[PDB]
Each structure stands twice: as C-alpha cells, then as structure tokens.
Design an enzyme around this catalytic site. Sequence first.
Site, short mmCIF file in Angstrom:
data_model
loop_
_atom_site.label_atom_id
_atom_site.label_comp_id
_atom_site.label_asym_id
_atom_site.label_seq_id
_atom_site.Cartn_x
_atom_site.Cartn_y
_atom_site.Cartn_z
CG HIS A 67 -1.96 -1.06 1.20
ND1 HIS A 67 -2.35 -1.75 2.32
CD2 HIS A 67 -2.71 -1.53 0.18
CE1 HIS A 67 -3.30 -2.61 2.00
NE2 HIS A 67 -3.54 -2.50 0.70
CB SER A 68 1.83 3.50 -2.79
OG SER A 68 0.48 3.71 -3.16
NE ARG A 69 -3.71 4.74 2.97
CZ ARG A 69 -4.97 4.75 2.53
NH1 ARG A 69 -5.37 5.65 1.65
NH2 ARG A 69 -5.83 3.85 3.00
CD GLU A 70 -0.19 0.71 4.44
OE1 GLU A 70 0.60 -0.24 4.61
OE2 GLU A 70 -1.42 0.53 4.32
NE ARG A 125 -6.22 -0.06 1.04
CZ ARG A 125 -5.93 -0.66 2.20
NH1 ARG A 125 -5.23 -0.04 3.14
NH2 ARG A 125 -6.36 -1.90 2.42
CG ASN A 142 -2.84 -7.11 1.97
OD1 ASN A 142 -2.38 -8.19 1.57
ND2 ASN A 142 -2.96 -6.81 3.26
CG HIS A 194 0.30 -3.70 5.45
ND1 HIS A 194 -0.54 -3.28 4.44
CD2 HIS A 194 0.70 -4.95 5.12
CE1 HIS A 194 -0.65 -4.24 3.54
NE2 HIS A 194 0.10 -5.26 3.92
CB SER A 195 2.07 1.98 8.66
OG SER A 195 1.71 2.99 7.74
CE1 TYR A 246 -9.12 -2.30 8.79
CE2 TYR A 246 -8.86 -4.24 7.41
CZ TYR A 246 -8.49 -2.95 7.75
OH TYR A 246 -7.51 -2.30 7.04
CD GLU A 268 -1.59 -3.14 9.44
OE1 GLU A 268 -1.47 -1.94 9.11
OE2 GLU A 268 -1.87 -4.05 8.64
ZN ZN Z 1 -1.63 -1.52 4.27
#
Ligand code: ZN
Length: 303
Positions: A67-70, A125, A142, A194-195, A246, A268
């Site tokens: 996820h690129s924004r992380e 993302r 993901n 991830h974050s 989740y 995370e």
């Molecule tokens: Zn992620």
Amino acid sequence: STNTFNYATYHTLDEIYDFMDLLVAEHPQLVSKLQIGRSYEGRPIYVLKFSTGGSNRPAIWIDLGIHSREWITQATGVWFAKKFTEDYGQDPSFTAILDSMDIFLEIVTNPDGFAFTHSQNRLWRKTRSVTSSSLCVGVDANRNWDAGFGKAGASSSPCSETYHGKYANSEVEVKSIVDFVKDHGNFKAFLSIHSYSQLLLYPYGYTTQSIPDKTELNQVAKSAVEALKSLYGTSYKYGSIITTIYQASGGSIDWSYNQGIKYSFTFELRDTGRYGFLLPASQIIPTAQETWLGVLTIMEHTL
Ligand SMILES: [Zn+2]
Ligand code: NA
C-alpha cells in the site's frame, strides 16, 4: 555509499532503487538484486536476496509498501536492508538465521503507487491498473490474493480503495510474488509490512475460523511484540486479522499461510492514528529499530 545514505528521511523510488544498487555493489557476497516482474506501468519490481550460499535453502519473505501511502514501511525496508549487512557475522542470532536461511526483501511492492504518492496523491493506496469500464484506477493489492478472494472484507467497486479487482492475482504486483514464492517452493516465513495501528497480526482475515497453529503463532506474536516494546515502550496488540483489525479478504498472509508457510504475519507499524500515514520522518529510525526486534524474534522461531 550506504554508510552516508540518509535513513532518517523519506525517499523517492529512484533513491530507493539507487540504494539497492549501492548495497549490492558494497556487499556482492551477501546481497543480490532480483527482478521478479514489471509493474502495471512497466517499472521494474525488485527483490533483495540476502544469502550466505547453500542449495535452494529455506527462505523468509518480507514485503513492504504494498500500500503505497504507508511510507514508514518502505523507509523501514531500506533500514532493514542495511541492518542485515551490518549484523551478519556480528550478531550471533542473526548470523545463525542467515547461515540456515535466505531472506527475500521487497522494499517497494507497489512502485506505481509509490511514484503516484510523490507526484499526485500522497494518500494513494492501490496499484495503478486501468479498470476498463470505469473512471477510477487501481486495485487494492492486499485484497487481490487467492485466499477467500471476493468474500466480505473487500469492495467490488473500482472506485473503492479496497477494490479487490476482477479476479485473484489480476495485479501483476501480486502475481509476481505468487510466481516467485511458488517457483522457489521452500518459504518458511512470510511477513507483510504495513502501517498503521501498532498491531502484529496472524491469519485469518477472511474468516472467523481460527488457524490450527493459533497457539504457536499467537505465542510467537506475543514474544515478538514484547521484543518490539522493549526498546521504546511502543505498545502493540496482537491476534488474528479478523479479531484484531477487521475482516479482510484476499490478503497476503492468508494466501501464504494456505501455502503451508506457517510463520505468516502482518505488521501494522507506528503510529495508532496521531500522525497516521503522515508519520514524520524523524520517527523512521526508532520505528525500524523496534520493528527489527519483532521481526528477528519471528525469524528465530522460524529457525
Ligand atoms: Zn496496508
Ligand atoms: Na517517486
């Protein structure tokens, strides 16, 4: 060089790729740069292989930046890469790991998204794949894996940031990993980074059914978060994806676990939401340091 590289700032794609080349040039007996495929937009997808030799020996997979924004994840991956080259032959535990196993480290799992977060949309993302009958672009990489694909915990809407795509493995970024891991055939750990939220997760995300190795993986995760916390007091929760964050379908570690890769975990990283995705660069090194202790703990258990 990698000695004078600034690990305490966020980098561009070119800067990370350049870093890889430096590390390989400096440590050719330990590190090689593998190209596992091409991104949707044609960028090379690179994996660093850390190996002391052997013949097709058991392996540990680590993906970051799916996820690129992380941004904390790619930044942590760069730090990790350097750390491996420093600690081999110095730290007894890490030395033992790299003596028996190879590590495959994919720092920028989604390079098109990563580029897009620098040029246009910091919070991007998804991948950047074109959806045929839509004004929206990209798939959540993901949610794209062949593990409960298309079930609850993903979107069927192309405009959603959790869009699963038309079919499992539609995204070349995901297919490249699948092919590589399957062709290799001997992965023992699979760690997806991830974050954010400060969680250490094990399968499953797609179903409330507990894994048959729940006792062991829960203990490993407990141990890893305690190792992580020891440095700065950073508190992590741990447990299955579905019970802890989740429900989520088509996720990487659900797939990897279903391939018999027992030690499948998702991190995370920092923080819990104060800065969220925009975690300031001064937090990169302390995050990477503490996260390393958690990852090392999992590797020791895999060993
Ligand atoms: Zn992620
Ligand atoms: Na970039």
